[PDB]
Structures are given as structure tokens and as C-alpha cells.
Design a protein around this ligand. Structure first.
Ligand SMILES: CN(CCCC(=O)O)C(=O)c1ncnc2[nH]ccc12
Length: 167
């Protein structure tokens, strides 16, 4: 039993809710919140900009030190950093950005990072400003992640389409 509430169960291990991941994170304090990161951990907009704003820019300060030490992530890769006031940990995961021409096949590799964590609060990778089809992203999530994932979908309209079209 865990503290996530109001989710629709899609599969044995995947759950979905119309929610703001920032507000969902501040209420659950999950062990892991997933950020929709880029390779530079520049949290300017989308999910990343919202998560970072909610940390009063502490996520960005920590991220800049990470990059100065380690260099950029790989597309499809991840790193574990602090969750600040939102979660114990933040798993920064880089899905491919279609608006940069990145290979959508890397979306599966991105979701594989979730399997290193027993339970996660997450957005749909490569959705939103990353330019992928959220229905495809949901399919890859369900077919790749084996750990328990609670997906927060900000837009009520897209949420309804994702549920209604789910196979
Ligand atoms: C709406 N999108 C896609 C567009 C932005 C992006 O591409 O990051 C989200 O990712 C998302 N999901 C869950 N809660 C969220 N709160 C703010 C954005 C957000």
C-alpha cells in the first residue's frame, strides 16, 4: 500500500491521473519524482521548468554543479539528484526531443531508467514541449517499465484521450 490517490489503473504496474506533477509531488512526497530533463539539465520550461520553480531554483543550482563535474547526460540517460522539497530523489531522465530531431527509438531507453526504482511519480517522457505523441509515449511506458509508475498528466483533455484510446 502506498499514498497515491485517485489514479486509474492501466496495467499491473502503470497508473494514470490528471494532475499537476508539482502539486502531486508536494502532497505525496514520493521517494522518486521523474523530471523531463534535457542533457544539460537546463530546467527552463515544461515539466522541468515547473519542478525547478517549485524548488525556488535549488534544483537548477544542484544541476549546474552536477554538469560542471560530470558533463552532459546522454539522450536516453538519467541521473539521480535531490528531490528538494518535492520528493526524496529526483530522477532526471532525458527523453528524445523531436523538436531537436532526436531518434524516437531512444524513448524506450529513457523509460528503462525507471526500472531502477521500485515506485515513481512521473510525467510522460518526450511529451509536451519535447514534441512526441503522448499516446505513443504511454504505449512505450507500459511496454518498458516493470516497476510501479504513477503518471501525472497535466492537461485534462489529453488525459481523456490517453484513457479512451488505451489498448
Ligand atoms: C504538459 N506536459 C508536457 C509539456 C511540457 C513538457 O514537455 O515538459 C508535461 O510534461 C507535464 N506533465 C505533468 N505535469 C506537468 N506540470 C507542468 C508540465 C507538466
Amino acid at each position: 500500500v502506498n499514498s497515491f490517490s485517485g489514479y486509474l489503473k492501466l496495467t499491473d504496474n502503470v497508473y494514470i491521473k490528471n494532475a499537476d506533477i508539482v502539486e502531486e509531488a508536494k502532497k505525496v512526497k514520493p521517494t522518486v519524482v521523474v523530471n523531463a530533463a534535457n542533457v544539460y539539465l537546463k530546467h527552463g520550461g515544461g515539466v522541468a521548468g515547473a519542478l525547478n520553480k517549485a524548488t525556488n531554483n535549488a534544483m537548477q543550482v544542484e544541476s549546474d554543479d552536477y554538469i560542471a563535474t560530470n558533463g552532459p547526460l546522454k539522450v536516453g540517460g538519467s541521473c539521480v539528484l535531490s528531490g528538494h522539497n518535492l520528493a526524496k530523489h529526483c530522477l532526471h531522465v532525458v527523453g528524445p526531443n523531436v523538436n531537436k530531431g532526436e531518434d524516437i527509438q531512444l524513448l524506450k531507453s529513457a523509460y528503462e531508467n525507471f526500472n531502477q526504482h521500485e515506485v515513481l511519480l512521473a510525467p510522460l517522457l518526450s511529451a509536451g514541449i519535447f514534441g512526441a505523441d503522448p499516446i505513443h509515449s504511454l504505449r512505450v511506458c507500459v511496454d518498458t517499465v516493470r516497476t510501479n509508475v504513477y503518471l501525472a498528466v497535466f492537461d485534462k483533455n489529453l488525459y481523456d484521450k490517453l484513457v479512451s484510446s488505451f489498448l
